[PDB]
Design a protein around this nucleic acid. Sequence first.
DNA 1: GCCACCGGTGGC
DNA 2: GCCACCGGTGGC
Length: 51
Amino acid sequence: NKKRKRCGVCVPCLRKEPCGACYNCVNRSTSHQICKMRKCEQLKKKRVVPM
DNA sequence: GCCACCGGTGGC
DNA sequence: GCCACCGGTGGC
Ligand SMILES: [Zn+2]
Ligand SMILES: [Zn+2]
């Protein structure tokens, strides 16, 4: 299988802007991680099978 | 080139 | 043995 995509319909997916205050927003330059408030509810579940 | 998922792992 | 952290890179 392939990498999973965001769902588009949970509250975080619907957020227009980054929150600007979580650990990942404060470390924008460094982080390869999405704003904690934009993280898709569906992607917080571990993959049923890995890659 | 950017966004950001996710396998791999160091420190506990 | 867990898991927060990271960084390579898939997908656009
Ligand atoms: Zn944030
Ligand atoms: Zn979502």
